[PDB]
Curated annotation (Swiss-Prot), chain A:
Organism annotation: Homo sapiens
Post-translational modification as stated in the protein's UniProt record: Pyrophosphorylation by 5-diphosphoinositol pentakisphosphate (5-IP7) promotes interaction with DCTN1. Serine pyrophosphorylation is achieved by Mg(2+)-dependent, but enzyme independent transfer of a beta-phosphate from a inositol pyrophosphate to a pre-phosphorylated serine residue.
Location in the cell: Cytoplasm, Cytoskeleton; Cytoplasm
Name of the protein: Cytoplasmic dynein 1 intermediate chain 2
UniProt keywords, alphabetically: Acetylation, Cytoplasm, Cytoskeleton, Disease variant, Dynein, Host-virus interaction, Intellectual disability, Microtubule, Motor protein, Phosphoprotein, Repeat, Transport, WD repeat
Signal peptide positions on this chain: none
GO molecular function annotations of the record: dynein heavy chain binding; dynein light chain binding; microtubule motor activity
Family to which this protein belongs: Belongs to the dynein intermediate chain family.
Record disease entry: Neurodevelopmental disorder with microcephaly and structural brain anomalies: An autosomal recessive neurodevelopmental disorder characterized by global developmental delay, severe intellectual disability, microcephaly, dysmorphic facial features, and cerebral malformations including simplification of cerebral gyration, agenesis of the corpus callosum, and brainstem and white matter hypoplasia.
Intervals holding WD repeats: 14-63, 67-107, 116-157, 166-206, 211-256, 259-299, 305-344
Keyword presence, DNA-binding: no
Swiss-Prot record, chain B:
Family, similarity comment: Belongs to the dynein heavy chain family.
Disease as annotated in the protein's UniProt record: Charcot-Marie-Tooth disease, axonal, type 2O: An axonal form of Charcot-Marie-Tooth disease, a disorder of the peripheral nervous system, characterized by progressive weakness and atrophy, initially of the peroneal muscles and later of the distal muscles of the arms. Charcot-Marie-Tooth disease is classified in two main groups on the basis of electrophysiologic properties and histopathology: primary peripheral demyelinating neuropathies (designated CMT1 when they are dominantly inherited) and primary peripheral axonal neuropathies (CMT2).
Comment, domains: Dynein heavy chains probably consist of an N-terminal stem (which binds cargo and interacts with other dynein components), and the head or motor domain. The motor contains six tandemly-linked AAA domains in the head, which form a ring. A stalk-like structure (formed by two of the coiled coil domains) protrudes between AAA 4 and AAA 5 and terminates in a microtubule-binding site. A seventh domain may also contribute to this ring; it is not clear whether the N-terminus or the C-terminus forms this extra domain.
Cellular compartments annotated: Cytoplasm, Cytoskeleton
Protein function: Cytoplasmic dynein 1 acts as a motor for the intracellular retrograde motility of vesicles and organelles along microtubules. Dynein has ATPase activity; the force-producing power stroke is thought to occur on release of ADP. Plays a role in mitotic spindle assembly and metaphase plate congression.
Protein name in UniProt: Cytoplasmic dynein 1 heavy chain 1
Part of the whole protein covered: 594 to 791 of 4646
Subunit structure: Homodimer. The cytoplasmic dynein 1 complex consists of two catalytic heavy chains (HCs) and a number of non-catalytic subunits presented by intermediate chains (ICs), light intermediate chains (LICs) and light chains (LCs); the composition seems to vary in respect to the IC, LIC and LC composition. The heavy chain homodimer serves as a scaffold for the probable homodimeric assembly of the respective non-catalytic subunits. The ICs and LICs bind directly to the HC dimer and dynein LCs assemble on the IC dimer. Interacts with DYNC1LI1; DYNC1LI1 and DYNC1LI2 bind mutually exclusive to DYNC1H1.
Lineage of producing organism: Eukaryota, Metazoa, Chordata, Craniata, Vertebrata
Region (Interaction with DYNC1LI2): 58-198
């Protein structure tokens, strides 16, 4: 069972565009961000036009319109900035929009210097809390750059990302684990997914684990079972149609869950109910599932209207619903409803450990 | 235990036909090649060249094809080959292997790049170039000379890390020279575009 709620779409700004990454309100509740892509059929329009919506207000208009010059390859909210919107681009500059200024252009654009990114940033993110935060931009070039949300003309802390060999690490949708232990996992271009540190001389790339050959599209981490498990588990996504569960100590671990007749594009599993991961396809199917109940099948899955290549999906934080980003500019909103967080749900840990023994 | 093999022989029919269903479905997917399929848009969104997206998509279908072949290899071991319908499965697979070939694309890539991109590589000197744009009034704009070269750099990196060939070293070093001057050009191009918009 999947509770298909309302949808968000506006032809005024989703006119034959590609829905890029998403994010829910990391500060507010259920008011999400939608990064888009350029539509070369409309060259007069801005390339990257981000948009937001408000599920808690129950309306249809894209509440805010924001648009830099280039195509926004990534976007999300800002940590403890209830007026700001951070953003990655295709060119390499990192933008910064504001809502209260009513300026449909970002007010603080990262330069295009070598010290900054001159390659698209697929994953730019805030990290800790009030005093524990920063802004880490990681372009596909292979550089990380810490930035304050105040100073943006120069990266606060910045270094590259290379393996033991001096070859580049074409990152794609990295993710910090729970707690910001600075050991963020990095979805590389294809295979060689890495764990990478930030503080110490050992910062950067820790080790390579390869369990799939198709080019990576996403990664995610999660939290506690209700203070039962460590939950450092992180699942990935790739173009080989398979999704592998990983560990911080394995190299070719846990069963690579494969969805056939579909090009996997993203995974993100809500820490609420320790295992409820949702993958997507290049056909219009949301085949999400829990590993405790099922084993290798989508639990309460659904397909999507028409055949949209579902680009990105995000669980509604601290609760349950699903944001859906397609290859076509349209946002769909589903919900589990009946797939409530099971209490004392350690069945999954016993399950994954029993599978891990073979 | 050749006792399970009896019901296996019974469902050999259903197993081989269902696997034929899936392989012909793959045939339908390949026949709707990469520039047509949604893999083109998605692969371009994640910034993959058409060469790279095409050959990656093709090798993924190759892997899924041999994956089904591995399934049938598990079905009977060796009897599935010269089976009642496995003899046709083998044919479907062989023709589908010939369909799924990327050396043609690799050759066309190295070809085109060595047919006309021999001079496209180091076009860094003439930084600015005026234009002509046949429209009403026939205006002229400003343009820097780095349009496909940057994608060629990405192409080489993708082939090298992805599969790795005996990639033309001259093109690799010319790509290296384009890389070491590329960010400058990005900044210039965006400045020009913002200038035009203003």
């Amino acid at each position: 069972k999947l509770s298909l709620n309302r949808q968000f779409f506006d032809e005024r700004w989703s006119k034959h565009r590609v829905v890029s990454c998403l994010d829910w309100s990391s500060q507010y509740p259920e008011l999400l961000v939608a990064s888009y892509n350029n539509n070369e059929d409309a060259p007069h329009e801005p390339d990257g036009v981000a948009l937001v919506w408000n599920m808690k207000y129950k309306k249809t208009t894209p509440e805010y319109v924001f648009h830099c010059q280039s195509a926004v390859m990534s976007a999300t909210f800002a940590k403890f900035h209830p007026n700001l919107v951070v953003g990655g681009t295709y060119s390499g500059q990192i933008v910064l929009w504001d809502n209260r200024s009513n300026k449909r252009t970002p007010v603080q654009r990262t330069p295009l210097s070598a010290a900054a990114h001159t390659h698209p940033v697929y994953c730019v993110n805030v990290v800790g809390t009030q005093n524990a935060h920063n802004l880490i931009s990681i372009s596909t070039d292979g550089k990380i750059c810490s930035w304050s949300l105040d100073m943006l003309s120069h990266p606060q802390d910045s270094m590259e990302l290379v393996h033991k060999q001096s070859k580049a690490v074409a990152v794609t949708s990295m993710s910090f684990p729970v707690g910001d232990v600075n050991n963020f996992v990095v979805g590389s271009e294809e295979g060689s997914v890495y764990t990478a540190c930030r503080h110490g001389s050992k910062a950067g790339i820790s080790e390579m684990f390869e369990g799939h050959q198709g080019p990576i599209t996403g990664i995610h981490c999660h939290a506690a079972v209700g203070a039962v498990d460590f939950s450092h588990l992180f699942v990935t996504s790739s173009f080989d149609w398979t999704v592998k569960l990983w560990s911080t100590k394995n190299n070719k671990p846990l069963y690579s869950f494969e969805d056939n007749a579909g090009y996997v594009y993203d995974v993100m599993w809500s820490p609420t109910h320790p295992a409820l991961f949702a993958c997507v396809d290049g056909m219009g199917r949301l085949d999400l599932w829990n590993l405790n109940n099922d084993t290798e099948v989508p639990t309460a899955s659904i397909s999507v209207e028409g055949n949209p290549a579902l680009n990105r999906v995000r669980w509604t934080h601290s609760g349950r619903e699903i944001a859906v980003g397609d290859s076509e500019g349209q946002i769909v909103i589903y919900d589990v409803g009946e797939q409530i967080a099971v209490p004392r749900n350690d069945e999954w840990a016993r399950f994954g450990r029993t599978l891990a023994e073979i | 235990r050749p006792h399970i093999r009896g019901a296996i022989r019974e469902y050999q029919t259903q197993l081989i036909q269902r696997v034929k269903d899936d392989i012909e479905s793959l045939h339908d997917k390949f026949k709707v090649q990469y520039p047509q399929s949604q893999a083109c848009k998605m692969s371009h969104v994640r910034d993959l060249p058409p060469v790279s997206g095409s050959i990656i998509w093709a090798k993924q279908i190759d892997r899924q094809l041999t994956a089904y072949m591995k399934r049938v290899e598990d079905v009977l071991g060796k009897g599935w080959e010269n089976h009642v319908e496995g003899q046709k499965l083998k044919q479907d697979g062989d023709s589908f292997r010939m369909k799924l070939n990327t050396q043609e694309i690799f050759d066309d890539w190295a070809r085109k790049v060595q047919q006309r991109n021999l001079g496209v590589s180091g076009r860094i000197f003439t930084i600015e170039s005026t234009r002509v744009r046949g429209r009403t009034g026939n205006v002229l704009k400003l343009k820097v000379n780095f349009l496909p070269e940057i994608i060629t750099l990405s192409k080489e990196v993708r082939n090298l890390k992805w599969l790795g060939f005996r990639v033309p070293l001259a093109i690799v070093n010319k790509a290296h020279q384009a890389n070491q001057l590329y960010p400058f050009a990005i900044s210039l191009i965006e400045s020009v575009r913002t200038y035009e918009r203003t």
